[PDB]
Ligand binder design. Structure first.
Ligand SMILES: *C(=O)[C@@H](NC(=O)/C(=N\OC(C)(C)C(=O)O)c1csc(N)n1)[C@@H]1N=C(C(=O)O)C(=C)CS1
Length: 264
């Protein structure tokens, strides 16, 4: 009933933003979906870290000690943003610590260690395919996976595919029960999300999310949302701009989430 209005409002937000906006909502109360450019490709940037962390969690289902396995951090492993890993240079971090740093602080060195643990970007993609995601592709390590060049298929997915995958990982059965709970705990402990999807939602709703930022002013967020009194929602908001040096626009993601919420 409200869906025509939501579509109109998302288009008006996009027009005022100057950029290109992609939205996918799944309401798990009734499997309703609301999409805006839901089948167009967008650069994932650091939102791809959810897939990498989940792939390591899947490996840990058959290796009970895997998350405690130490990984060496060398000075040469530091990249453009690595607030956790830099404390451990010439030392080690466990795979659990790398997963938490990648997800909750968006540490790019930590993401690179997860990618390497999976055999490279193609190993992350192979895990995506194993859980039914035919759209996701990871092609590069950080920081270059965040270049976000328009038209480049590398390191992209669609909002529809990412919402479905995030649902399967956090609420469905793609991971074992303990691993699903650990992923949800990590996402709920994210430090980077208060200005993005969360900022558009009622403060009483619990959120776990993973943000992303990259070239072309790319500003992304993927979230699982537990509204008050309601089954959870999954929401992807992806946003990218026409000039390489464009500024971040987390407010656009908040505005998209607000429009989605007001139409529930
Ligand atoms: C994931 O998206 C990561 N993004 C980046 O490394 C890039 N830019 O992000 C920062 C450094 C925050 C920025 O100035 O926008 C990047 C790599 S190559 C390029 N042109 N830009 C991490 N993502 C986030 C996040 O938004 O979640 C961070 C907070 C840390 S970097």
């Amino acid at each position: 009933a409200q869906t025509s209005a939501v579509q109109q409002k998302l288009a008006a937000l996009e027009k005022s933003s100057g950029g290109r906006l992609g939205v996918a909502l799944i309401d798990t109360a009734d499997n309703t979906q609301v999409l805006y450019r839901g089948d167009e490709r967008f650069p994932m940037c650091s939102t791809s870290k959810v897939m990498a962390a989940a792939a390591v969690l899947k490996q840990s289902e058959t290796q009970k000690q895997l998350l405690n396995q130490p990984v060496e951090i060398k000075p040469a492993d530091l990249v453009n943003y690595n607030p956790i890993a830099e404390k451990h240079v010439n030392g080690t971090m466990t795979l659990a610590e790398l997963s938490a740093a990648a997800l909750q602080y968006s540490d790019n060195t930590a993401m690179n260690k997860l990618i390497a643990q999976l055999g490279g970007p193609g190993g992350v993609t192979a895990f995506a395919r194993a859980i039914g995601d035919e759209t996701f592709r990871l092609d590069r390590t950080a920081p270059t996976l965040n270049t976000a060049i328009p038209g480049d298929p590398r390191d992209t997915t669609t909002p529809r595919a990412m919402a479905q995958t995030l649902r399967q990982l956090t609420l469905g059965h793609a991971l074992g029960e303990t691993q699903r709970a650990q992923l949800v705990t990590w996402l709920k402990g994210n430090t980077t999300g208060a200005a993005s999807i969360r900022a558009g939602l009622p403060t009483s709703w619990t959120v776990g999310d993973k943000t992303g930022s990259g070239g072309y002013g790319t500003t992304n967020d993927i979230a699982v949302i537990w509204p008050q009194g309601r089954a959870p929602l999954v929401l992807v908001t992806y946003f990218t701009q026409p000039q390489q040096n464009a500024e971040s626009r987390r407010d656009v993601l908040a505005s998209a989430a607000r429009i989605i919420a007001e139409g529930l």
